[PDB]
RNA sequence: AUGUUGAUAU
RNA sequence: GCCGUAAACGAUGUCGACUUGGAGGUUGUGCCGGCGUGGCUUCCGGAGCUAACGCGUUAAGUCGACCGCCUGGGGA
RNA sequence: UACCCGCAGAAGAAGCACCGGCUAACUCCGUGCCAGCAGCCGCGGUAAUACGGAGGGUGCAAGCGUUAAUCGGAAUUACUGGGCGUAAAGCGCACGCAGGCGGUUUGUUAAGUCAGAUGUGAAAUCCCCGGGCUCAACCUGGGAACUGCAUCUGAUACUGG
RNA sequence: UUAGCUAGUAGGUGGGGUAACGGCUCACCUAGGCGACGAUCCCUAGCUGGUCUGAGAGGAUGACCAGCCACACUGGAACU
């Protein structure tokens, strides 16, 4: 129920960055990341609208770290909830206890988050919450415990969350290190890489 | 044998509308008089007339518009064969709204809008588009 | 500016006396995004110069659809030879439910939300114009109010 | 026949 | 078809038929082997394909087909079979299951090594 | 009001008894067409009064025999 | 006037 | 007297209404060789329809009523 | 017992199917219409992306496959929603009982039809907005829904009498 | 590719019987009653809330949970 295989070679699948590694160096130098896996890794077959489809449900699970029942199941909630179908879906995803204590800055990676949150490291609102799928709701604290305040892996996140692009949807305290989610993430705020509609329609069919 | 007149009616526009005619003639009777009020309100057809008393003889003059006829479509949905009656959460919409269903109410013929601001249902006559 | 999509390569064979001489066939779509699109079926010894004659002949044979907010004014039926295409305005993100050739006419045209449905014959070529044959005999309020000579809030 | 052709 | 008519005489739905009648509903049957032998496909294709007749324990005859290269099967084994025709075997319309009762898995297979009954290699 | 059927009279033949056919005129289920479904009732007709062609009232009560449990309220129209 | 046939797969 | 079937065919059920034309054939009739007006019929063809072939006021067009019948090939 | 606290150490914990097209994923070797594969089309006759193995890859993952079974896709029984010149389909032709259907006007009736009201439609289930188990499954509050049925009272255009 | 079925049969009168209406039973009378809106006969089957599928209309289904029915080795009978 985790992948614990290699990481980059699922970048180089898709073709794109999905931040599995820390992001101390270029995911350039660690591998090749033009190249998709393997012997015929050169070769790039044309792609058919299913394979594309494929692809982008593939791309949006492999950062998140959902395998494909629990994903299906967002997709499931994410129709059955009001409004558009595909923005619902990255929301449900955003709103994952272990991608928000990534995105806060607490785990260097969404898989070190996760370890974080799973090794009872991770408090909601005062209560330790040791699921990586328990969704965080607005106006919710979320924080470190006093005893995994120590880890040398906490500072060093934190240090890496500067480098990237603040969520306007969270704020965070490094001192403290606590943050509230403030609000669910808009489509805006997350990246238009992802191409929703392409995951609705594998799913629609 | 003839066993629907109100479909004959609306075959006679349904055809004379295609072969261009400027006017319809068939005979007359109650209902049939009560449908082309219908039309001629809501401007499908532009007048109609009824001339005789032995055997009356209605007489729609029909329209069209930028070369095309106005009627674009018309169908019988009630029928000898099979009878449709609707109530009025159920009233038809014919092309979203856009075109009409002529229903028969206990107060009077009139148009599924009509019908529904009426409250009534009743006998689904024809749909016209 | 034009969305171009390549819906179908077919290849086909006339015999001669040597043998099977074969070709391609290759039927595209061109539209704006608001509600102009038109079908090109091009044919040539190579897949390439199959598509760029179908690509020519589509840009030539657009045709306008009254679109409304980005769906349709009201259900549809197209027909052509044994295609039956059916058509109905959807909610805001529905998205396109259709069949791959309907969804590239749809697409192209500038309908995001719309249930498709094809019955009968899938043949591309004649899904396609069904398809099309649909969306041009489709009625706005405004055109439905000046053949009925009425406003279009009489009418709606 | 020929127990099974062309030539 | 009018409508008075479909009231006199409504529609009729395609009965639909099983292309496994002798499993009679179940995903296996079992059953005992009478002939064990080969035969020849039909065109376009050839091959000396192993077969079994098999009595099964519902008292239906039926051919079987053995999948895979080489077996241990003769008269009186008692085996389990399964749904699944042979295409070019007209008649064949059952496959043994490989691994089952005194079927063997297949030898030295390592690929699909569940389709062919065969425990996986020690690593 | 108290419930009543209403139906034509099809035998008489019974010493103060009767057959109803109550015809009802109901939409089809699957197909739509309105059809006649008759039912039939064998009603108490105490005196003997109605014959074959009247339209009769007739009220359910206490069973009075094996197949009666309906009585007649008055002839509606004769024949 | 008559005047047969062309193994299997590809 | 029986049989009761045929590629018993227009391979096209019956009845009714409606919808541009042209050239005939046949059989009435009215008005004065012409000008109408009925019936039945042959060929072509327009819109429309049709997978196409074609059908096309004697429809396979546009409609209504009722009936008969079809549901892969074989086995039959 | 749930739960909490402490201890030690990455320690005790990954497989299954698939990769010719449909369908995401390709190469080498072996075999040579054999052995074998196969859901459908098909593959194998000495240069096999289709057999068997290997390496690589794809999809799922404490499961994965296979078989059985239902609906869907199938407008392929078509009420919604199909056909019958030649694809399957017009009885060889008629008369005609039952049945279905019925030109036009007025009145009347109120069966169909329509409108309203009332009663009923167990609870659970489904659906919506909430709540509770760390989350979820699960549990649960209130609603909505239960498209129906009956009764009463009106309407009278249409259908019936 | 089951068209006729039915003599307590259908109804009446009176007596008996049941907690109770009733051919429930009996005597007598009448000759009815059911059936192409499918009786009778044959095969299959517990029914429902629901369940699965389906855009819907439908199709399939009735395991668990809850309501109703039926049965308790087989056949029959009453007693309390
Ligand atoms: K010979
Ligand atoms: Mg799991
Ligand atoms: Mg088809
Ligand atoms: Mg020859
Ligand atoms: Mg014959
Ligand atoms: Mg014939
Ligand atoms: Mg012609
Ligand atoms: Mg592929
Ligand atoms: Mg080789
Ligand atoms: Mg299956
Ligand atoms: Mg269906
Ligand atoms: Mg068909
Ligand atoms: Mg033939
Ligand atoms: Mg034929
Ligand atoms: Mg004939
Ligand atoms: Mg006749
Ligand atoms: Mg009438
Ligand atoms: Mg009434
Ligand atoms: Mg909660
Ligand atoms: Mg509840
Ligand atoms: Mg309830
Ligand atoms: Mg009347
Ligand atoms: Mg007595
Ligand atoms: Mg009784
Ligand atoms: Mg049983
Ligand atoms: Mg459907
Ligand atoms: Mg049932």
Redesign the pocket.
Known sequence: ??????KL??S??EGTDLFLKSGVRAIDTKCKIEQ??????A?K???????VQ??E??KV?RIYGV???????YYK?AA???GNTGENLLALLEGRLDNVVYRMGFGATRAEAR?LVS??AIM?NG?????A???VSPNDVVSI?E?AKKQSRVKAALELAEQREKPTWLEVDAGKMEGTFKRKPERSDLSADINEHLIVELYSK | ????????M???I???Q????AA???????????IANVLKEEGFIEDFKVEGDTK?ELELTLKYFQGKAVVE????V??????I??????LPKVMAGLGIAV???????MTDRA?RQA?????I?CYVA | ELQEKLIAVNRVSKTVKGGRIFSFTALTVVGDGNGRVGFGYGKAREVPAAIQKAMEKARRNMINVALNNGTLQHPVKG?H??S?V?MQPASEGTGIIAGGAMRAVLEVAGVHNV?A??????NPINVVRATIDGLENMNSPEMVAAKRGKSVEEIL | XXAXX?? | ??????????????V?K????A??????KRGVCTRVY?T??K????????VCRVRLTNGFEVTS???????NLQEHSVIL?????????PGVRY?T?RGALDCSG?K?????????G????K? | ??????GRV??????????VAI?????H??????????????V?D?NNECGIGDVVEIRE?????????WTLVRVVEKA
């Open positions: 129920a985790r992948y614990l295989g290699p070679k699922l180089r699948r998709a896996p393997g012997q015929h890794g070769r077959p044309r792609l058919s609208d299913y394979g494929l692809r449900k593939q699970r395998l494909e029942r629990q994903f299906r199941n909630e059955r909830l009001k370890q090794h009872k909601v209560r330790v919450v040791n699921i799928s328990y969704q415990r005893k | 044998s003839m066993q629907d007149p109100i479909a004959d609306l075959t006679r349904r055809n004379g295609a072969a261009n005619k319809v003639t068939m005979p007359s009777s109650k209902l049939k008089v009560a009356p479509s018309i169908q019988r009630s029928r000898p064969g099979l009878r009656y609707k109530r009025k959460d159920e229903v028969s109410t206990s107060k009077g013929v019908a409250g009534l249902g009743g006998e006559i | 027909v030879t044994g039956r059916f249930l449905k094809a019955y009968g014959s899938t | 062309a030539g | 078809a009018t409508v008075n008519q479909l009231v006199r005489k409504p529609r009729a739905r395609k639909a099983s292309n496994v009648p499993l009679e509903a179940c995903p296996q080969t020849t496909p065109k376009p294709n050839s091959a000396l394909r192993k087909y053995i999948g895979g290269e080489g077996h079979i399964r749904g699944g025709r042979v295409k070019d075997l496959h299951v297949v030295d297979r390592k690929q699909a090594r569940s389709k062919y065969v425990k996986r290699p690593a | 009001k108290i419930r009543t059927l209403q099809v035998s008489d033949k019974m010493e103060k008894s009767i057959v015809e009802r005129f109901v939409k289920p699957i197909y739509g067409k309105f059809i006649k479904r008759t039912t039939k009732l064998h108490h105490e009560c206490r069973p009075l025999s094996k197949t009666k449990s």
